Structure formats: C-alpha cells, structure tokens
Amino acid sequence: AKRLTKAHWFEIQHIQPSPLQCNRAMSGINNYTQHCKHQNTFLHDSFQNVAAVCDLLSIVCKNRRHNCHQSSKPVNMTDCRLTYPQCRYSAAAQYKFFIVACDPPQKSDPPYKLVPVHLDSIL
C-alpha cells in the first residue's frame, strides 16, 4: 500500500487470524523491507481482538514508555525464524501472553480510542 500507518503495519506483521506457512506469510513483509527478516511472531487472533488489549491497564514498555498493555490470556502464535527474496523459515507453535504498545489512531486508521502499533513482548 505504498504508505501505511503504524497500526496497519502492525496488522500486516503480526495479525494472522488463520495460520499460514511462514515462507508464504513472510514473503509480503520481506518485500516491503527488501530483506529477509530474521524473526517474526504472528498472533492467531483478529485485529479487533488484539486491539481490545489496548483498553486494558497501561504498563511500562521495553523503551520505557507507558503505552503498553498486556493480553488478559495467552494466545496461539507462530514463531518464524530465518534459516533474498528466497527467504526460508522454520516455524514453532507457541501459546503465550503478549504486550502491545498502543497509540491513538492516525487519520487513516479505524476510529478506535487506541490502536496497537508494536509487539513489545511475548511472555
């Protein structure tokens, strides 16, 4: 999409409601960046459900900001690890809590109060 909001890029990178193979799912991401990303975590939940985490209590992020929010329960995920543009990955299923950073929406985002913009942590 030539240009993207932070939240839209978050969705592209990290929202995968139905699992895909890592090699296929990473192809689009690696095309936008022109490199084989070495690792990526895909969350198997909808954008709407991940965005609801932003309404939960705010907590500190790795970068020392306080716009992070922890999921109330674990979710299923796929961890893709690089093993260009012929990038090949290994995959691991995971079931973990996550922490997202959230910001107010940009003009081009859905008009929630807050939207998820970064995957801060898995735990």
For residue 104, give both structure tokens: 């107010």
Cα 70 off chain centre by: 13
**Options 8, 14, 35, 44, the catalytic residue:** 14
CATH architecture, range 1-123: Roll (3.10)
* Burial status of residue 64 (CB atoms within 10 A of its CB: 0-12, 13-18, 19 or more): exposed
DSSP state of 72: S
**8 part of the active site:** no
The strand pairing partners of 76, in sequence order, are 95
Give me the resolution in angstroms, 1 decimal: 1.5
Per-domain residue ranges of the chain: 1-123
44 is catalytic: no
75 and 96 Cβ atoms separated by less than 8 Å: yes
Residue ranges for the known binding site for substrate are: 37-41, 62, 81
Buried b (16+ CB within 10 A) or exposed e, 100-112: bbbbebeeebeeb
Vertex 92: Cα angle to 89 and 96 (nearest 5) = 135
CA angle 76, 79, 81 (to 5 degrees): 175
